[PDB]
């Protein structure tokens, strides 16, 4: 089916005037596979997935050199940003960046991304056309000019359409059977009385991969939405994910409520009820 | 594989 690769960067300054920390993490769908952390004597890119270990020393050095260079340049960027916003030395701030490529069912690129935030808020983003920028404010417009002068968009576009797609296809093949296998959710409905407003009907979905899922309660064949408690999709720790959705029901009316689950591993939505 | 940033790629 559809797949993506994403690199997440974090560059954050420390109090006073210490050396800012740069962290890079790489992801194929919901599977972390590399990490680099600049806070060490001799920092190196490290594998976080079995299927990347087979990559030779040259692959690892290329990563490390990119991330070591970024460590230095993202420091200058942090100084640039605290100038734009007239912020003082001490003084803790964060540049966040996410980029990468999405593949459709065919294996062809659907879209590329490059997105930056400053202190948790959208700052600058590469547009869908992979050739223009959307800047949040006048400070981001200064960044945009620098990046237009340096043809950042054109070089990112070349990366996203080639290198990004090429390597994502490699990891998908090398990591197939884990990356290219969709585990369907195991589902059940539990019943917990509470007397006042009667009972809870909780709809579970467990052990599914990837994380993307839809869980909704219907009453008489109608999306409830307003009075349904949705929990955040959470990792089980063994690479699978968990989610539940619960509603409060007037006891002996459980049978008019249905749970609905949509997932990549399910050929069609499951309609579920409470089993007495 | 990540992208390499050329010269003058600062924010």
């Amino acid at each position: 089916g559809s797949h993506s690769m994403r690199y997440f960067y974090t560059a954050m300054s420390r109090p006073g005037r210490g050396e800012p920390r740069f962290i890079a993490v790489g992801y194929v769908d919901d599977t972390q596979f590399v990490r680099f952390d600049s806070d060490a004597a001799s920092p190196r890119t490290e594998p976080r997935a079995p299927w990347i270990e087979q990559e030779g020393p040259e692959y690892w050095d290329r990563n490390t050199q990119i991330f070591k260079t970024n460590t230095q340049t993202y420091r200058e960027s942090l100084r640039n940003l605290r100038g734009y916003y007239n912020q003082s030395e001490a003084g803790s701030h964060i540049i966040q960046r996410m980029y990468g490529c999405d593949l459709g069912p065919d294996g062809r690129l659907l879209r590329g991304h490059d997105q930056s935030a400053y202190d948790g808020k959208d700052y600058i983003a590469l547009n869908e056309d992979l050739s223009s920028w959307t800047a949040a404010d006048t400070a981001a417009q200064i960044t945009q000019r620098k990046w237009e002068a340096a043809r950042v968009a054109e070089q990112l576009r070349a990366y996203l359409e080639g290198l990004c797609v090429e390597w994502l296809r490699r990891y998908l093949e090398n990591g197939k059977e884990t990356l290219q296998r969709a585990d369907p959710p195991k589902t059940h409905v539990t019943h917990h009385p509470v007397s006042d407003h009667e009972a809870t009907l909780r709809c579970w979905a467990l052990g599914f991969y990837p994380a993307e899922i839809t869980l909704t309660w219907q009453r008489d064949g109608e999306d409830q939405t307003q009075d349904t408690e949705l929990v955040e999709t959470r990792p089980a720790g063994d690479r699978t994910f968990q989610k539940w959705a619960a509603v409060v029901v007037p006891s002996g009316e459980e049978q008019r409520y249905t749970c609905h689950v949509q997932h990549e591993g399910l050929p069609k939505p499951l309609t579920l009820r409470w089993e007495p | 594989h990540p992208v390499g940033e050329a010269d003058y790629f600062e924010y």
Partner: T-cell receptor
Amino acid sequence: QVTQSPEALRLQEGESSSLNCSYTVSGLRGLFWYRQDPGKGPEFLFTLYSAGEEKEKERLKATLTKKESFLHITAPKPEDSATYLCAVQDLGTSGSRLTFGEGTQLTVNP
Amino acid sequence: MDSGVTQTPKHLITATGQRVTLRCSPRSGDLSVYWYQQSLDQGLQFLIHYYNGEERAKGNILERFSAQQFPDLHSELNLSSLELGDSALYFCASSARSGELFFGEGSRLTVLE
């Protein structure tokens, strides 16, 4: 990483030829052509970024494929005698460094 | 014609075991300096790269070779304990924001016994 052919070119005035530059790179940032006269530094000619891009200036025309670049010299004159240098930048490396071929030393017999 | 990059001295003749310093000013507005070496019957070889006073990347530069970028943005390349095989053309380039490298006119070194 960058291989140019032929090493030396011996053309007659008016005899067109095209100089090869083969490249292998993790991802192409930019392909460059330079001219270097004896006792001079490389002088900028062209930069090509994507497969199918062409650039032309007088007797010189540069094209780009996934695997190589060609510098076509049409009806060359004695003045065109020089070494023609090919170079590439890589998307997998930081900064803007060039990796050069060894060049094509062209002499045009008047 | 000339790019705008200034390289001196144009010519150096010296003895083996000696030390020389080459000078480079980038184009006005360029902040980077790249050093290259061209030996006879050999192409340009990347030595070392600076940006805005800071070392950025390193080629196959020998340990007895060293360089710096100053606040001026000008750069000095030092070659010490010179050997006959150090005889070469040494080129510096500065990069533009747009990506292109623009070269100086070179310093030619001849090392004699």
